[PDB]
Design a protein around this motif. Structure first.
Motif, mmCIF file in Angstrom:
data_model
loop_
_atom_site.group_PDB
_atom_site.id
_atom_site.type_symbol
_atom_site.label_atom_id
_atom_site.label_comp_id
_atom_site.label_asym_id
_atom_site.label_seq_id
_atom_site.Cartn_x
_atom_site.Cartn_y
_atom_site.Cartn_z
ATOM 1 N N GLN B 75 0.756 -1.104 -0.019
ATOM 2 C CA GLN B 75 -0.226 0.252 -0.223
ATOM 3 C C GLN B 75 0.878 1.286 -0.045
ATOM 4 O OE1 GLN B 75 -3.569 -0.381 0.000
ATOM 5 N NE2 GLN B 75 -2.799 -1.881 -0.827
ATOM 6 N N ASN B 76 0.022 2.882 -0.593
ATOM 7 C CA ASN B 76 0.659 3.515 -0.335
ATOM 8 C C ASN B 76 2.200 3.706 -0.194
ATOM 9 O OD1 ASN B 76 -1.445 4.673 1.266
ATOM 10 N ND2 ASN B 76 -0.362 3.374 2.781
ATOM 11 N N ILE C 20 -22.461 -0.688 7.640
ATOM 12 C CA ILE C 20 -22.692 -0.478 9.195
ATOM 13 C C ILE C 20 -22.247 -0.532 10.104
ATOM 14 C CG2 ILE C 20 -23.598 -3.148 9.772
ATOM 15 C CD1 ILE C 20 -25.620 -1.892 7.866
ATOM 16 N N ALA C 21 -20.921 -0.262 10.106
ATOM 17 C CA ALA C 21 -19.906 -0.479 11.429
ATOM 18 C C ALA C 21 -18.455 0.100 10.848
ATOM 19 C CB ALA C 21 -19.475 -2.096 11.913
ATOM 20 N N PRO C 22 -18.121 0.789 11.109
ATOM 21 C CA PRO C 22 -18.441 1.175 12.586
ATOM 22 C C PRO C 22 -19.623 2.423 12.758
ATOM 23 C CG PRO C 22 -16.776 2.042 12.538
ATOM 24 C CD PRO C 22 -16.533 1.492 11.307
ATOM 25 N N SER C 49 -10.715 -0.769 9.202
ATOM 26 C CA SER C 49 -12.175 -1.643 8.514
ATOM 27 C C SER C 49 -13.116 -1.212 8.745
ATOM 28 C CB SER C 49 -12.477 -3.489 9.254
ATOM 29 O OG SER C 49 -11.236 -3.830 9.112
ATOM 30 N N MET C 50 -14.421 -1.578 7.718
ATOM 31 C CA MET C 50 -15.813 -1.171 7.273
ATOM 32 C C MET C 50 -16.213 -2.338 6.746
ATOM 33 S SD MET C 50 -15.950 2.547 6.109
ATOM 34 C CE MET C 50 -15.031 3.117 4.808
ATOM 35 N N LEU C 51 -17.919 -2.251 7.821
ATOM 36 C CA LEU C 51 -18.467 -2.897 7.466
ATOM 37 C C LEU C 51 -19.813 -2.297 6.465
ATOM 38 C CD1 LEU C 51 -19.775 -5.800 7.077
ATOM 39 C CD2 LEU C 51 -21.248 -5.998 8.939
ATOM 40 N N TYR C 53 -22.578 -1.175 2.865
ATOM 41 C CA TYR C 53 -23.153 -0.937 1.709
ATOM 42 C C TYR C 53 -21.966 -0.882 0.233
ATOM 43 C CZ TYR C 53 -26.974 -2.627 4.820
ATOM 44 O OH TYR C 53 -27.909 -3.214 5.242
ATOM 45 N N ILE C 59 -23.501 -5.894 0.447
ATOM 46 C CA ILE C 59 -22.818 -6.288 2.362
ATOM 47 C C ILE C 59 -21.740 -6.499 1.445
ATOM 48 C CG2 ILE C 59 -22.276 -6.574 4.319
ATOM 49 C CD1 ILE C 59 -24.393 -5.904 4.862
ATOM 50 N N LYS C 61 -16.937 -5.784 3.289
ATOM 51 C CA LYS C 61 -16.172 -5.484 4.512
ATOM 52 C C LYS C 61 -14.676 -5.620 3.751
ATOM 53 C CE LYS C 61 -13.316 -6.862 7.238
ATOM 54 N NZ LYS C 61 -11.634 -6.557 6.967
ATOM 55 N N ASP C 63 -10.487 -3.101 4.221
ATOM 56 C CA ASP C 63 -10.099 -2.732 5.267
ATOM 57 C C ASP C 63 -9.710 -1.178 4.387
ATOM 58 O OD1 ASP C 63 -9.549 -4.509 7.031
ATOM 59 O OD2 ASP C 63 -7.748 -5.375 6.372
ATOM 60 N N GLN C 65 -7.669 1.848 3.010
ATOM 61 C CA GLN C 65 -6.178 2.478 3.430
ATOM 62 C C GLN C 65 -6.122 4.423 3.382
ATOM 63 O OE1 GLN C 65 -5.354 -0.814 3.122
ATOM 64 N NE2 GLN C 65 -3.268 -0.310 4.891
ATOM 65 N N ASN C 66 -5.447 4.895 4.540
ATOM 66 C CA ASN C 66 -4.740 6.032 5.234
ATOM 67 C C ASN C 66 -6.229 7.106 5.638
ATOM 68 O OD1 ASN C 66 -2.747 5.882 3.024
ATOM 69 N ND2 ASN C 66 -3.934 5.289 1.530
ATOM 70 N N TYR D 36 -15.065 -10.597 13.559
ATOM 71 C CA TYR D 36 -16.267 -9.821 13.634
ATOM 72 C C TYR D 36 -17.415 -10.766 13.283
ATOM 73 C CZ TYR D 36 -16.108 -9.802 8.175
ATOM 74 O OH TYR D 36 -16.103 -9.683 6.988
ATOM 75 N N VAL D 49 -24.251 -12.974 7.520
ATOM 76 C CA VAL D 49 -23.932 -12.340 6.653
ATOM 77 C C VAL D 49 -22.469 -12.637 6.292
ATOM 78 C CG1 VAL D 49 -24.198 -9.781 5.976
ATOM 79 C CG2 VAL D 49 -25.449 -10.441 7.538
ATOM 80 N N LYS D 50 -21.801 -12.308 7.235
ATOM 81 C CA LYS D 50 -20.195 -12.337 7.317
ATOM 82 C C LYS D 50 -19.847 -12.100 8.804
ATOM 83 C CE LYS D 50 -18.163 -11.002 3.873
ATOM 84 N NZ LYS D 50 -17.142 -10.446 2.306
ATOM 85 N N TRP D 54 -10.768 -8.576 11.663
ATOM 86 C CA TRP D 54 -11.181 -7.198 11.488
ATOM 87 C C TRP D 54 -9.632 -6.057 12.068
ATOM 88 C CZ3 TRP D 54 -15.808 -4.716 10.386
ATOM 89 C CH2 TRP D 54 -15.988 -3.573 10.845
ATOM 90 N N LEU D 55 -8.890 -4.600 11.794
ATOM 91 C CA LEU D 55 -7.827 -4.213 12.216
ATOM 92 C C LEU D 55 -8.420 -3.351 13.028
ATOM 93 C CD1 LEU D 55 -6.422 -3.698 8.466
ATOM 94 C CD2 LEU D 55 -6.239 -5.180 10.259
ATOM 95 N N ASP D 57 -9.935 -1.537 15.971
ATOM 96 C CA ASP D 57 -11.514 -0.294 16.072
ATOM 97 C C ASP D 57 -10.883 -0.424 18.090
ATOM 98 O OD1 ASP D 57 -13.054 0.528 16.098
ATOM 99 O OD2 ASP D 57 -14.412 -1.064 14.935
ATOM 100 N N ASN D 59 -13.930 0.006 19.466
ATOM 101 C CA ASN D 59 -14.780 -1.391 19.699
ATOM 102 C C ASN D 59 -15.021 -2.054 19.982
ATOM 103 O OD1 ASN D 59 -17.526 1.285 18.007
ATOM 104 N ND2 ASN D 59 -16.883 1.549 19.749
ATOM 105 N N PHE D 77 -23.890 -6.240 14.495
ATOM 106 C CA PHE D 77 -22.773 -6.796 14.090
ATOM 107 C C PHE D 77 -21.721 -6.467 15.311
ATOM 108 C CE2 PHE D 77 -18.475 -4.350 14.656
ATOM 109 C CZ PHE D 77 -17.467 -5.096 13.152
#
Lengths: 91, 85, 75, 92
Positions: B75-76, C20-22, C49-51, C53, C59, C61, C63, C65-66, D36, D49-50, D54-55, D57, D59, D77
């Protein structure tokens, strides 16, 4: 719809991966594919195959070709689905 | 944004891994794009510098210590776009 | 002198139905930099990370970056 | 140290991914790794779902169990730390 390639992990077991099959790439920028092998004493040992991210040396390249002359690990780059199934070598 | 000729420009420069000493541990590619951000930037409303506003990854085929080949999308490692602070 | 301030943000505050998250992330922002010009800009970044749409009930998921500012510095 | 976690993709097919199994989470030099689980408990029946890595967080910090906190969402979640911690999930 955009990019899908031949996958191959010579070390698949330790790496807890599939030994082969096909990988689907994500990225808008170009999407290529590669193939790394060894050509030592009349034997071609696959090293890796999979999706390769936007390398200019891989543009408008329909065939995966190794251009370097005397390498230990060969490598070829290409643009176009499953293009990495076949690989050759020149100089 | 381009960079041919003043203002926040993105200069495009290539680098051979040989010209740095890394050609031995990096199988592919043979080099990368060391792009940088150079250019004058307007005034605020404090100050503003021409900095990167966008980073893209590069794919590499290299050996790690244990002499075993890895393929990771680093990355980057490429400066894609420049802008002002 | 350049300082990493800790600014946290929200998603309904800006995507609450998209992501969805976080719910939100420690974003942070960048101080005074000396003489050639110097601005207090981010020098280190972390992915998050992101969950969320895809586009039409799909859905995903990944990661991204930046997206988080780790450590600032002078240009 | 190393961290592994139960993997899952209800849409593994179109996506061309294994449907389940473990996933080793590889990450940042000194940053924490979590797990997760996402699902839809809409009928009284639960839909996976999944599930995956997870990196870092916040939470997820120091939570040994995967617990979905938010009340009545369309997509539940949960976040936890510690290997395979996401195998078992709940709401609270």
């Amino acid at each position: 719809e955009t990019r899908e390639c031949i996958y191959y992990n010579a070390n698949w077991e330790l790496e807890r991966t599939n030994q082969s099959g096909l990988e689907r790439c994500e990225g808008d920028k170009r999407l290529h594919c590669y193939a790394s092998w060894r050509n030592s004493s009349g034997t071609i040992e696959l090293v890796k195959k999979g999706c390769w991210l936007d390398d200019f040396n891989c543009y408008d390249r329909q065939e995966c070709v190794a251009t370097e002359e005397n390498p230990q690990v060969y490598f070829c780059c290409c643009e176009g689905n499953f293009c990495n199934e076949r690989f050759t070598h020149l100089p | 944004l381009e960079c041919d000729g003043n203002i926040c420009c993105k200069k495009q420069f290539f680098v051979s891994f040989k010209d740095i000493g890394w050609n031995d541990w990096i199988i592919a590619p043979s080099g990368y794009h060391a792009n940088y951000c150079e250019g004058e930037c307007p005034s605020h409303i404090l100050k503003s510098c021409c900095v990167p506003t966008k980073l893209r990854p590069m794919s590499m085929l290299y050996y790690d210590d244990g002499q075993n080949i890895i393929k990771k999308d680093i990355q980057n490692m490429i400066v894609e776009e420049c802008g002002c602070s």
